[PDB]
Amino acid sequence: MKETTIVVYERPDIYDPIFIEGLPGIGLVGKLAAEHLIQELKAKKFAELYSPHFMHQVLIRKNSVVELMKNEFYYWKSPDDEHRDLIIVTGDTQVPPTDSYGHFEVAGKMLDFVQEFGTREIITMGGYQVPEIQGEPRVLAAVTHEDLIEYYKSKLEGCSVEVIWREDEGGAIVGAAGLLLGIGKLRGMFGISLLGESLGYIVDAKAAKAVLSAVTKILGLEIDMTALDERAKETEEILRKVEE
Amino acid sequence: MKETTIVVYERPDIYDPIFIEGLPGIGLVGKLAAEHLIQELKAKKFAELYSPHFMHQVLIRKNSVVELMKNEFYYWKSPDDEHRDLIIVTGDTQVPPTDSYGHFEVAGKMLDFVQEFGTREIITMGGYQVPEIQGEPRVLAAVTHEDLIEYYKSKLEGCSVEVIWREDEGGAIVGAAGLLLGIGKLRGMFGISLLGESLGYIVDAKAAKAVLSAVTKILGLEIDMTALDERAKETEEILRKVEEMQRA
Amino acid sequence: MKETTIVVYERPDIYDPIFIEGLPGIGLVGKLAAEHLIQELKAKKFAELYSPHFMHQVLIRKNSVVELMKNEFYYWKSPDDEHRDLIIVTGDTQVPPTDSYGHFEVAGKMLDFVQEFGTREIITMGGYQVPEIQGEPRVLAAVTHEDLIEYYKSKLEGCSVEVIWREDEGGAIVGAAGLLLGIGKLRGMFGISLLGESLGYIVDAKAAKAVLSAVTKILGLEIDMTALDERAKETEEILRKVEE
């Protein structure tokens, strides 16, 4: 483990898949979204990523087992000509905020891996932190190439969630949700970032549903959001009582 | 020394040893435990580790001698077919909390070295930070593979110390007590972490006793714990004599 | 992205240019000077630098596009034998304060690249933080070689801007504005540092004009400074009203 390493269990017959990322970040939006999507498509884990730039610890898993912090790749093989093969990543962590080089190298490895499957296109998901939400959560969209605005807009027409095409020039997207797109763009890849508005300090199941709604709209997939509905239901009532 | 270096004095006549880790950590628990085990077994020193990821200083040793910070490997050859040979590592320090990469590199070099002797199995010892202790220190256990819970449970049947099989999902073991097992598991190695409840800012001889009772019990060894008892008693006295000094 | 990298779009027909640097720094002085110089000369972009030592984020550009933080090289081809060709570097950022090694790597890569065009001479622009400025901001000068004092002093003869030859021995110039000269010097390159006195916590157009007047005087160019004058006046009005 002298560098970031990917352990491969299975080499699935997917072709030109879309790489979807939902690693930990603001309100765990991306992580929830990605975990939900994996569950509903019954995606199969085929690989895990370990990095010596991750925090130097193991985690307690189920049944008293220890394990390094990792990220995991899942695939989904479309049964149609009408839908894309997917690779979804999610995981325990990102590189700590104090090692920028490590983010570049982890993202670099993630990209090298998905490209072996002919991956060209990336969707990242995460949250955008706001002091107060004033209604339904908006989803903020940004792309790697201008011509993709019109492309993702057409695939989004008829969607519940309000997607806002960001115009906050000089704003930043920190960590994998940005770097996979910024580094991917240098090597001929392309895609879109979708960040849901969120208070950020809580697990945000509601904002995760909105993001996943935009993403599944793009993909032309329909999936059950109830699990996320009730999580939002629960945590809302918990917050009531905490502020009393 | 562009990287972590191990200086090896001899190749000991050992095989399939268990690798035991007691580096500095919470309450100096793992360290006291390992040093006591070194001493009672008359384990022999055979290698030392230096690292450019350790703090950039020398320590004053006995006799006005300076030396880089280091870890030390000791071995014990069993006199019989019913006890495993041991490699035991301890030392001055671990890599500082700000250099995660260095922890992986030091742990990885320790694992490469110990596998040269056929090591498969690892036991790590250390502390689990707790706001207060209610009587007898408990020992928390976690393993690298599920099947090993009853393996080690069997070995531990009848032990005096209470051993809790950890259920704190998403809790963390930081540094070598954790990385040796986490990285070891990627290489097909296996083992168990045993961490003792400790206040943490004290040299905790008594929690060290409890961890080392659990470990020697798994090993089939009986080791005299006297010197640890005596250190726990001495530090107990001095602690409460500080709890009276705080009338200032 | 294993290392700091430069992407070359064009190799212009320039030779022995002067390398001018204006990266972000105190007051954004160097950066505003460089951008204004680029705009007024209509200099042309020809290369971009990316680094895994830069902060691990992408930025939002215009029209909802994401990109890695980067630096950009611009050229100006002199139309006559009495002015020098120029390479001007500017960009989003420098390496963060916590990674010294990265500053050296990025500075060394810039110098490798400009040396391909026969660059020996460097002018760095930036700011010098002061607790107050009464009067016009002064520009502090320092050079790589003692014999260059007279050299740039003659070229500065006539200038409105007051240029002080620094004597604060043991003072420091931090980041590219210092490293490009210090590293340059080891390769047989040479040049001068110009730092405008600035309060430092505001975008300092007035001090940018002052540094750029000293630089264009040295280059023998006459540049319209109006856009900077106007920006300076807008910000002084703001500051006066904000103190109220």
Next chain:
Amino acid sequence: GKMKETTIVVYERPDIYDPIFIEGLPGIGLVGKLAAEHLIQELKAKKFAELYSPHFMHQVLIRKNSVVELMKNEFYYWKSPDDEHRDLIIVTGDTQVPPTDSYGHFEVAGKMLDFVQEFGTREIITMGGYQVPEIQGEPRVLAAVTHEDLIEYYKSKLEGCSVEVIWREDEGGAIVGAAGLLLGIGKLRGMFGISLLGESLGYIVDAKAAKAVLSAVTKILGLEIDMTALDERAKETEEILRKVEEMQ
């Protein structure tokens, strides 16, 4: 002038034999650096090489005459005019690697040792400071060595010395930075030598403790060096202290 790593720019390969490597880089009280600089001056030691490092702070310094220059270390040699005193290599400079980059300290110290070994260097003397809360008498110099057998050796070079040298006993104490690492890394390569640290308050430029340390050094070397420029500096700073504490 690639700065991918620490690099030494060599001006001359001095005709020197088995020199003693003397280090006096910045640190506590600037004790080692003043001592080195005054030794260089009094001895007319000649500058023969310069060290630059991408692990130094990312800045240039303003020198005399409005000149910028990277931060650097400089190597000076003294050719002994006779077989009764050793040739010397003396290092000093603007700075050491920052406290946050332990790896960088090992790398820099590493390159220094590689360099001096090209000239046959075996023996190292490092000079610096040891922070105290007050000084009661004349400053003492605290000594420690790479090998036990060297205590007898340096102790018999020091008999009749006007400064008092304490063979330190603070087992577990640390020497941080090049003063420690040159000896610590050196002894891994078979080199050897001594640490001399002068008692100092640290926040002040301490010419007096520098004289103490340089007296012990020159003694060990068999050299008589005029200490007056240090005397006068110590005089100046002791009357500036007084008057700065009149106002506070």
